[PDB]
Amino acid sequence: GAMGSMERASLIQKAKLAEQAERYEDMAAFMKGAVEKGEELSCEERNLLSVAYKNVVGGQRAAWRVLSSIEQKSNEGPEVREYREKVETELQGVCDTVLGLLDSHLIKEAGDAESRVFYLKMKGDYYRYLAEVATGDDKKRIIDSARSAYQEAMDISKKEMPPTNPIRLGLALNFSVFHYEIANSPEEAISLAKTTFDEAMADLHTLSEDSYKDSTLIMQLLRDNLTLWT
């Protein structure tokens, strides 16, 4: 691609500058270029990749919701549908790009739990964003792809990580949200968030001050959803 001529280290440096500048489309392009160098990503680099695309797709999701809401009010010219479709297609393209990077070849080469769970959670997340805008037949298959990715990530995280591990906690939070918002399974969402919270609570005594802060932050997010849902 267009980043083929830039050094990997220069791409990472520019991704960090783009983050500071809140230039998230640039940041995503830089991190895509870094992934396409073919080497594995460090922990910091994985988080830069995720920050970049989370912000890009987050803007698209917010825009899609505004337009879909106007479109649905409009049905109580073709322009609202056309423009919603344009944004939807762009959103789908970003999700497909992220899923492509994970499939070529980040997940395949990810052997450690911290990297493999991170990437499989991302795969679940971006199928979930596809599911948010999907409708018929495709929606069922997209939902199952999200579920499968989250489930593999869950299986690894329960075998290989402590219950306070922030990657494990964030995965459980998002899988629970998948159950509630996508899969029409609020009871599974609640059960997963509660069991996750309770098992982390019992492990907090093992944690340093800084690890305690990181784990309790995500535990509070789990609690926030449980409060909303119960």
Binding site: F118, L173, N174, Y180, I218, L221
Partner: peptide, 8 residues
């Protein structure tokens, strides 16, 4: 939306 993890 807005229920998921707000960072990576």
């Amino acid at each position: 939306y807005d229920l998921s993890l707000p960072f990576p």
